[model samples]
Target: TIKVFTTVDNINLHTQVVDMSMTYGQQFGPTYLDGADVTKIKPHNSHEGKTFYVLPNDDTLRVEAFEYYHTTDPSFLGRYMSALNHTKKWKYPQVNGLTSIKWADNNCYLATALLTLQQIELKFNPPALQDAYYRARAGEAANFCALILAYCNKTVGELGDVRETMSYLFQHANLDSCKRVLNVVCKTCGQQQTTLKGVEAVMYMGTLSYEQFKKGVQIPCTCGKQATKYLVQQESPFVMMSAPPAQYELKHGTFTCASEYTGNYQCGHYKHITSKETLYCIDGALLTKSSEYKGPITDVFYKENSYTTTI
Candidate 1:
């Protein structure tokens, strides 16, 4: 049981290294995919920028080793499929109904799995070349990118392995250039993560999910543009339900104002009072006790007008 798992891990790791080597090849002239101007470049591992490993041999030997490593190994596709089929009981907690785990839905699972594989590769691979070697002796690391491109482009029907087709597309088409080609050329429908499961079912039935044979066969955004694995899986309606609402109306506090004015003389104080004795004035006023005011009223109560109408 664990033996199967180890093989899967190894295959996954190999795919990543291959992917990184191809990405590194892109920067300085020709890439391994084109077989043009392949140059020796420093390949780094997942240990951030903190660490780098020395290449043991020249580019020719390295490329040879890489090719031998892949070609001589046991059927990676078979092992991967077997390992995938073996995990029938495994459930994705985020995905409902165990639908993602069904053996027939393997293609759908592979679509997502490949994205994860590429993401891991990008994380581990060094962004820039560390050393420059002699042009006469420099070599480039071999890549599986061309192989993946070939796979996605190949036609498959009920008799063929759509899951494997999905596996390669998800793996390589992550790069913008790779995706652009597929976006223009691929005729397969039900490639979107949201629609992949249902599309897989159609593959088993008589008809093709998409008619690549037709001339104007438009490529769907099978893998959405600039979409990450998280974006694909979490894009579903079910996943959105699992998320909290965009905004929550939380109860913060209560607001209040004080009672009617009972204190000192203010501009609006007389408005609040219903008493006939209360007098309202525009400016500061003097209230005469006798009601017979003469000459500025010697005995006067000065009420300062301080308030203004807000409205």
Candidate 2:
């Protein structure tokens, strides 16, 4: 298998051999000690009795795949995209009408891009890149197409090669660095999360944006709505009784009361969303008598006041 993977130029067609599923072939590129990447694929297909082509191997395809992706699928739309992700002069693509930074629906991709551009302007943004971003944003369709191309051209010219752009990709596909991306939550389904360093490095470069991050390179909710973000926090801790004290408090976050609190509860937005702990006060505090809402032992709010034994 090892010799076949690297040296074979011709097809290593297989017949039947259904038992080899786990031993010989895989769906992705092998690990470095072995291969996998989103860009690798083969042009051949022969599924007759468990038949398939042995991949062209990593060393040969690695840069090629990255190059293909960098240039956008080796066709019209791809080149334009490569430019969009590019940064040379960070200007519009040199095409006929492609210019501007806006998108089709203003959904997740646009959302993340918008977030990144905004973050850069405020933090580590470069002046020329900022100017270009501003122009691209007021995008016109055919023109929007060209703008991305120009951006790609800039990436090559300004950064020296695809190496930077390609290298920068994985850094954030794992996590987000921007503060605005603080904590993502999906309302249609509910709940989500983190902050990571790899993502931060990308933002610091001020090249990409929310169009990529935690969850993945693509943006948007897993279900219906666009993903949402949370602010750092406004209050240290605040818990209000639902009705007098029958209910402990709205599940804020990281509170002891929650079984596995999803932390999706919200009627209005908050600067901070969570409790020091999901504690409740009732019956004992004279808050209520039902008992189910007592919450944790430490949650009790004293009724009136007491000094141990009223000594």
Candidate 3:
């Protein structure tokens, strides 16, 4: 008999906490694949932030975790870039302009997953020094994060037993971090409800059908608060999809103006955004009614080409 997932060994993770630049939190978010459009990753669950690395070079699955790190009491941007540019198997490029990490050997999915992990982590409060101390070694909660990526995929043994074991491990587990990394790095403060089956469906498949979404079941926010989870707009698969950190190249001279008055002005990125009397950002980032670059007017290039006369 071949053993696929017959035995359960204690999982281990060097990094206890994960940090990403998502929602300010991960109550809801989108899922991207191969740098292309995908679901909003609705039916958000505890595993929303958990990631699987399928990079082109290493065409296998590798799990990531975060340590309760402190590279000096640096600014949020500094902390973010610090965690981002790590000495891991994956090297994050310096799109933030602080480092000179080249873009070679990088793909969209890998980058996205790293950012996604940190974003989701930032959503929660900071972890405790006590918790970090315990989880530093063979801590149940420390290594537990690595378990969920594929542990749930196991079918050889009783999932119920494993689920129970996991529940015991996370039994009243608290991820809330005391050190508010930033004012933007806030905690989840509301409740949303869903069926158990509904919850599993999203995990099995990141996106859910409208019917699956509209299921009449109750689920609580992971923040351990009183705010009830409101019905997420079935249409809004992700709570919000933010713009990639603005790049140095595109930072200075990028500008587009709305003709005569565009009620809803949007930038040229990646998303299927359409605004009505209100506004709905389906694909790309949702921008204000008007947006213009802050580069000096002289920096703006509307120069008349010598090849063509200005009309």
TM-score (all chains, Cα) for each model: 0.15, 0.19, 0.20
Colliding residue pairs in candidate 1: none
Better-scoring candidate (lDDT), 2 or 3: 2
RMSD of each: 32.4, 23.4, 23.3
Clashes of each: 0, 28, 20
Tens digit of per-residue lDDT, candidate 1, span 181-207: 111323333233322322121111211
lDDT for each candidate structure? 0.22, 0.28, 0.22
Ranking by TM-score: 3, 2, 1
- Per-residue lDDT of model 2, residues 1-311, tens digit only: 11222211112322223222343334433211111211233322232232232333455543343332332222433333344343322322211122322222211122222322222222213222333445554542322323333443432223122222222332313232322224566756666655434334222221111122222332377675676553222111211111111223333332322111112232111111112333222110022112233222111111111111111
By summed lDDT, the worst window of 10 consecutive residues in model 2 runs over 302-311
Candidate 1's TM-score: 0.15
lDDT tens digits, residues 1-311, model 3? 11111001112312113223332124212222222222333222443333322111111111112223211222322222222233222332332211111222222212222222222211212233234323422212222222221222221111222122222223223322211100111146522233222112112121112222223222333454433222232211121111222221112122111001112222112211122333222211123331222211111111111121121
Output the lDDT of residue 157, model 3: 19
Q: Which candidate is the best by TM-score?
A: 3
